């Protein structure tokens, strides 16, 4: 329906004649200058903005998007054609490949019509990589939305890298030499596997019939960097009833090494099939990578924020169906906002929950995971692994400054207990399947949940007498809250009344402040992440005064209450977290006092 | 296995229409087809050298490649006639192209018409000796199937063979009016007897005429024919398909 030669000239015109006013309004042929760099071997990857083509030909952009692979080859060959024009210098023969290319060109020039076979592949006249970048108009597409309809097209998506293979050299063009005629033979490769050539199709051996047997030559052949990865749907993309879905992505050439597992990246590239036969052939799909980017209200809303009971109202909104435990609900809110990480400081707020089974514990985590903008749920895989040959990140990695809710925490494997210890220590996960301590940046807050063994908690039995965890690890947690099934006939009756209402209404009883929509909550959280409140040194005097006071109480306590500098630092995290809730960039004495109150209540929970 | 677009044929078909689009230029070919419309014939005559002037490359392609290039040209002709008049174009199933002018090496004689010119246009000159009767030749036979209430076609073109039963073995009754037939005649040319060495054997070349070209020749006529020299299915008999005949 359209002559590619005609399209070839338009892009060549566009490349040679598109410019944009650079810094200080410098009229510059952006691609032309890159072409000058390319001819000098100063560039290899040539990323192409499609919006520049949209600047003068949006019709061409849609045609490009309608079949991205075709226009990629057109753009590549156009660059191959225009390179001698922008060539001005003969740079040094970078690597064997340039001089081998030059030697190949010399022999070709030493040759007049020529058969199509007796000519070098265009993909061997390379060492410039070409890619596109998706237009701003074409919005990023959810993975689940991308289906067989959109194959053969360029699209932009966003997700989380579950895993990346190591960089390896993928062959581009196999090169061989005839046994007898000594002629060079080429073989571009498309599929991930192929059969090596045997007999040379060169004219001389063809005529001579001398049994010229091709033998491959790695120096002759051309390779490219190549790694394999599987992105995953972002948490927000997946509805609550669904689960994330993976997409294999093939990164190659310069694009490699640009991502790690857990990176919330955005990829633009071509969605194409790979054949690793009922009513047609069935074939696995993948997304050939082109560009990779590692990503990061109304006035009445502000009036609501100005309310002194705002954070209290927000706390009530955290699992309102869960009657009681409002102080805990506040503590969960602090975890969701987290700290500041001023400079660094460990802004993560790891909270551990212990108590008898049947106390909303499991249900609380689920609400937090639903509320959390990015989260993981596990029971105890958790840590990374080296599958057989790819780094597969565990749910701890997939948190990545989200929250890794961990039910059944007491029954975790002791190896994992050591692993999370490192996470709370350095916010990193070191794993060695083959004795190779590969370290991954597992920044995240850990929300643990456990129960005492042998049924309900026994106050007569000390802490860690009813629970089988290292007491040191419990100290690592920013907060540790205990829940006890005290039979309180009135309060138990109040809970029973709450349950019956829910049965008779499928809703909690009408609270003082109604719970808010989770989206609104997350918007407030995102606004809170914007803030990084500071600690004035005047507050330090009162903070230290409070700290030594409670430390004295610990010395007074017959049982050591885990008071240490860890306890002070956690109090700092809570106070600045409260300052984020206030939308005030200075921590208040009120914020400090409330954090101490929660600290005291957590200690009082140990009663 | 169904062709979608031919860029070369697209361009070639376009270029012929551009060549036939003789309006800004001297208007000779526009006047010709207008005369062709008035005269009711369906075979334009064309000087090859003017085509060389407007496009040497296309003219070279035409002489070297006959069957494909003419088909594009006929397409351009039919559209061009449709442009000037749709209904007159619709009267005729097809239109034809007549070549003329100087043919440099392709202008040969039956003695010199070697096999090297196969699938090349040739402008033969000689004397007609054998003539065959006019016969109507079917090209597009149209059939109706009352069992299936279905109408089918079958072209023959260059290509028991006559279809009479549905694949379900239902009877097929032909549709004579719908089908396409064309008069068809065969003649034989020889070198002019005065300029013909006695030592050499006779070199007689067959010729195929169709449509209005059928009766434009008799035995003992000194005629120049321009056509496409083609083999035949089987050591293969070889014949010349006339594109235009003129009696010098």
């Amino acid at each position: 329906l359209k002559d590619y030669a005609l399209e070839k000239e338009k892009v060549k015109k566009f490349l040679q004649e598109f410019y944009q006013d650079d810094e200080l309004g410098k009229k510059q042929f952006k691609y032309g200058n890159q072409l000058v760099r390319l001819a000098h071997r100063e560039q290899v990857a040539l990323y192409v903005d499609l919006d520049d083509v949209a600047e003068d030909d949006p019709e061409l952009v849609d045609s490009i998007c309608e079949n991205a692979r075709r226009y990629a080859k057109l753009f590549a060959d156009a660059v191959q054609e225009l390179l001698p024009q922008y060539k001005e210098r003969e740079v040094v023969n970078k690597d064997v490949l340039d001089v081998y290319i030059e030697h190949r060109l010399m022999m070709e020039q030493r040759s007049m019509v020529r058969s199509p076979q007796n000519q070098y592949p265009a993909e061997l006249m390379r060492r410039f990589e070409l890619y596109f970048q998706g237009p701003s108009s074409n919005k990023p597409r959810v993975i689940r939305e991308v289906r067989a309809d959109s194959v053969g097209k360029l699209v932009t998506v966003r997700g989380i890298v579950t895993r990346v293979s190591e960089v390896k050299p993928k062959m581009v063009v196999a090169t061989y030499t005839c046994d007898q005629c000594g002629a060079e033979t080429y073989q571009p490769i498309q599929s991930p596997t192929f059969m090596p050539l045997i007999m040379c199709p060169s004219q001389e051996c063809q005529t001579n019939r001398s049994g010229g047997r091709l033998y491959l030559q790695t120096r002759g052949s051309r390779f490219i960097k190549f790694q394999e990865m599987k992105m995953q749907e972002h948490s927000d993309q997946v509805p609550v009833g669904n689960i994330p879905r993976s997409i294999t992505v093939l990164v190659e050439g310069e694009n490699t090494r640009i991502a790690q597992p857990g990176d919330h990246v955005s990829v633009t590239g071509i969605f194409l099939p790979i054949l690793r036969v009922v009513q047609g052939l069935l074939s696995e799909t993948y997304l050939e990578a082109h560009r990779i980017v590692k990503m990061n209200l109304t006035r009445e809303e502000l009036r609501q924020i100005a309310e002194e009971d705002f954070y209290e109202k927000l706390a009530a909104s955290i699992a309102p169906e869960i009657y009681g435990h409002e102080d805990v609900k506040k503590a969960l809110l602090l975890l969701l906002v987290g700290g500041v990480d001023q400079s660094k400081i460990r802004g993560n707020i790891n909270i551990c929950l212990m108590g008898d089974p049947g106390v909303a514990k499991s249900q609380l985590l689920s609400y937090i995971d639903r509320l959390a903008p990015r989260s993981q749920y596990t029971t105890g895989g958790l840590t990374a692994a080296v599958l057989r040959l790819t780094l597969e990140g565990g749910a701890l990695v997939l948190a990545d400054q989200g929250v890794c809710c961990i039910d059944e925490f007491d029954k975790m494997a002791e190896a994992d207990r050591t692993a999370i210890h490192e996470v709370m220590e350095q916010q990193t996960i070191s794993i060695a399947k083959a004795g190779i301590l590969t370290t991954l940046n597992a920044r995240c807050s850990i929300l643990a949940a456990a129960n005492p063994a042998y049924g309900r908690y026994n106050p007569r039995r000390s802490l860690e007498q009813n629970i089988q965890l290292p007491a040191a690890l419990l100290s690592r947690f920013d907060l540790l809250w205990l829940i006890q099934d005290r039979p309180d006939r009135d309060n138990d009756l109040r809970l029973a009344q709450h349950i019956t209402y829910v049965h008779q209404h499928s809703r909690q009883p009408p609270s003082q402040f109604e719970p808010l929509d989770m989206k609104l909550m997350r918007r407030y959280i995102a606004m809170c992440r914007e803030k990084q409140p500071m600690v004035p040194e005047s507050l330090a005097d009162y903070i230290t005064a409070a700290y030594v006071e409670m430390r004295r109480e610990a010395w007074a306590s017959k049982d050591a209450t885990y008071t240490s500098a860890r306890t002070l630092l956690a109090i700092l995290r809570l106070s600045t977290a409260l300052a984020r809730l206030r939308m005030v960039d200075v921590v208040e004495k009120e914020d400090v006092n409330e954090a101490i109150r929660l600290m005291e209540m957590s200690k009082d929970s140990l009663l | 296995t169904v062709v979608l677009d031919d860029v070369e044929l697209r361009e070639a078909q376009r270029d012929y229409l551009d060549f036939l689009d003789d309006e800004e230029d001297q208007g000779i070919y526009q006047s010709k087809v207008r005369e062709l419309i008035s005269d009711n014939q369906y075979r334009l005559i064309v000087n090859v050298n003017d085509l060389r002037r407007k496009n040497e490359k296309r003219a070279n392609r035409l002489l070297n490649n006959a069957f494909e290039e003419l088909v594009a040209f006929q397409r351009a002709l039919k559209d061009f006639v449709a442009s000037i008049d749709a209904t007159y174009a619709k009267q005729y199933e097809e239109f034809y192209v007549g070549l003329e002018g100087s043919f440099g090496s392709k202008h040969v004689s039956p003695r010199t018409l070697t096999s090297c010119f196969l699938s090349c246009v040739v402008c033969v000159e000689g004397i007609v000796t054998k003539c065959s009767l006019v016969r109507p030749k079917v090209v597009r036979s149209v059939h109706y199937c009352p069992a299936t209430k279905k109408t089918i076609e079958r072209r023959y073109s260059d290509l028991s063979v006559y279809p009479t039963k549905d694949e379900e073995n239902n009877p097929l009754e032909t549709e004579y009016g719908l089908s396409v037939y064309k008069d068809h005649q065969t003649i034989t040319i020889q070198e002019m007897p005065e300029k013909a060495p006695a030592g050499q054997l006779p070199r007689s070349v067959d010729v195929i005429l169709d449509d209005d070209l059928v009766d434009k020749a008799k035995p003992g006529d000194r005629v120049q024919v321009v056509g496409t020299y083609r083999c035949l299915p089987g050591t293969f008999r070889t014949v010349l398909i006339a594109c235009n005949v003129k009696q010098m």
């Binding site: 081998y100 370290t439 330090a540 860890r566 | -």
Partner: protein
């Protein structure tokens, strides 16, 4: 030139032969005499010499190493046929170039460098037996015993499938021992971890010593390997000829270099600040700035960083001396012990971090494991053969582990009876052990053995036992908090270079001042203990500490101040551990 290259056989050989005879630091012709006298026909070359002599030939060399090296051999052999024209050698001279391109970030390697010579620094992790690789297979007919051979059929061996004498069907079976073989020891080596910028994913590569340079390097050796980068296909199945489009890449080693510092400014700068009178105090306080109110502990670990001078007691028949210092920090949980180990391990070069539990990922031991090559996986102690192993929770350890720690502390080596054979893996590490009191806190009036429950022998092997406790002093809590909140809102690099240079260059030797001072200190301690008295192990600790303290001052000789401070810290450790 050979196709696709700029390589002339004669000119490259002549230029190389010119480089051999003509050189400015001529040493090549001298070691040729060493090879002629010794008869070892391998003439190793620093490629940087070729770079200095001729960068183009060096560039030409690296571009086509497999092709240029035979020219280099022909150059040297004819030189050997010129210099010492008559001699006897089991094979003519070879060359093993090295030290050419320090693109040693193996994590940063590209397909552009395929079949290009490179050198990289790394620690060999796993090795294997030399693979007997077939190169010519003798064959014998089952029917008529037809003797025949097939020679180097491109890795695989082409089966005859038909006899040659009786010409029956496939009856010629290979004869194994009659076949020809070569040695190819496979070696798996890890990228030098200190050299890596991030270290988030340490890199490993396979290496091969083909018929030469085989078994010369054992596991754990941090060396520079020089050889040709190489990549090959892998068949999708052994039976089918299809291959992957990706090539697994390895190295065919050519030379192993077993392994000045910085520039003049740094040696000038560290020597300048070494002259400061309070460099010992400043360096101690500068060490681990996030710590507060800890100076005796900082000084002791600082002396462990510098360590005592290496001492060769081979002539005395006394065995190797524990030149390294081992310090056990015992204190209540939450007293910054873990931070101290992490800070030192992060700061220290070629050090290791582990925990007393067997659940530690690295593992403090070495042992065999099958893929199914029963190959030895090393341990952190063996890995830190010259570095420092920061061991956390040393109190919580297995008795089998505790026996190993006693052995290496007694010997600075580890004996492992792998399969049946025994290997003594040297471990001259500095052990920074950290232990916590049993129960919630340290019970006062209970000895370290009571409150940590370890053998008296093993804990006695620790030259220093630093006891730290969190006092119940609200003023200390107040000052500590103000220090922390102050931190809430000298760089390590200069200190690291100071210690490395002191290790590299300065080797303190005893002075009779130090000798008499140490003897006076011990007998005074003996007299104090005459009424846990003094022991000659305490003298050895005082000996080692004075060496370290002298090394701190860069005096290059042990002075009385080294003895005096060493005795002071030794008494401080006694005072910290004093109980009676």
């Amino acid at each position: 030139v050979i196709w696709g290259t700029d390589v002339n056989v004669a000119a490259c050989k002549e230029n190389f032969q010119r480089f051999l005879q003509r050189f400015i630091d001529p040493l090549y012709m001298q070691r040729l005499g060493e090879i002629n006298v010794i008869g070892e026909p391998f003439l190793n070359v620093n490629c940087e010499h070729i770079k200095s002599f001729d960068k183009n030939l060096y560039r030409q060399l690296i571009s086509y190493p497999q092709e240029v090296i035979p020219t280099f051999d022909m150059a040297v052999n004819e030189i050997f046929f010129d210099r010492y024209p008559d001699s006897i050698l089991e094979h003519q001279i070879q060359v093993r170039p090295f030290n050419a391109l320090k693109t040693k970030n193996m994590r940063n390697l590209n397909p552009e460098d395929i079949d290009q010579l490179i050198t990289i620094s790394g620690m060999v992790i796993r090795t294997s037996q030399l693979i007997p690789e077939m190169q010519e297979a003798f064959f014998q007919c089952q029917v008529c015993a037809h003797t025949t051979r097939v020679e180097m059929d491109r890795g695989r061996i082409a089966e005859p499938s038909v006899c040659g004498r009786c010409h029956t069907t496939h009856s010629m079976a290979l004869i194994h021992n009659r076949s020809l073989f070569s040695d190819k020891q496979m070696i798996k080596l890890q990228e030098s971890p200190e050299d890596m910028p991030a270290g988030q994913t340490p890199h490993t590569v396979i290496l091969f010593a083909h018929n030469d340079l085989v078994d010369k390097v054992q596991p754990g050796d941090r060396v520079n390997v020089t050889g040709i980068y190489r990549a090959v296909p892998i068949r999708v199945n052994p039976r089918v000829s299809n291959v992957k489009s990706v090539y697994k890449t390895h190295i065919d080693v050519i030379h192993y270099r077993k392994t000045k510092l910085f520039s003049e400014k740094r040696v000038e700068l560290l020597k300048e600040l070494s002259r400061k009178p309070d460099i010992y105090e400043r360096l101690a306080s500068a060490l681990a700035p996030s710590i507060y109110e800890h100076e005796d502990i900082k000084k002791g670990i600082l002396l462990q960083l510098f360590g005592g001078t290496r001492k060769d007691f081979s002539h005395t028949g006394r065995g190797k001396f524990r030149a390294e210092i081992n310090i056990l920090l015992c204190g209540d949980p939450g007293t910054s012990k873990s931070q101290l180990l992490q800070y030192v391990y992060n700061l220290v070069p070629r050090g290791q971090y582990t925990s007393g539990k067997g659940s530690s990922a690295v593992g403090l031991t070495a042992y065999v494991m099958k893929d199914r090559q029963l190959v030895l996986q090393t341990g952190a102690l063996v890995l830190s053969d010259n570095g420092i192993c920061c061991i956390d929770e040393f109190d919580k350890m297995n008795e089998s582990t505790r026996s190993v720690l006693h052995e290496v502390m007694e010997q600075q080596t580890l004996s492992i009876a792998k399969a049946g054979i025994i290997c003594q893996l040297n471990a001259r590490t500095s052990v920074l052990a950290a232990a916590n009191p049993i129960e919630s806190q340290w019970n006062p009036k209970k000895t370290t053995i009571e409150n940590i429950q370890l053998p008296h022998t093993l804990l006695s092997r620790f030259d220093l036992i630093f006891l730290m406790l969190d006092p119940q002093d609200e003023a200390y809590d107040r000052r500590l908090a103000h220090h922390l909140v102050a931190l809430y809102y000298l760089d390590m690099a200069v200190l690291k270079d100071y210690i490395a240079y002191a290790h590299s260059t300065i080797m303190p030797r005893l002075s009779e001042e130090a000798s008499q001072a140490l003897i006076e200190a011990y007998v005074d301690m003996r007299k104090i203990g005459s009424s846990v008295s003094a022991y000659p192990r305490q003298l050895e600790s005082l000996i080692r500490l004075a060496e370290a303290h002298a090394k701190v001052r860069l005096s290059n000789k042990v002075e009385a101040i080294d003895v005096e401070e060493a005795k002071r810290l030794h008494r401080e450790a006694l005072k910290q551990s004093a109980t009676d």
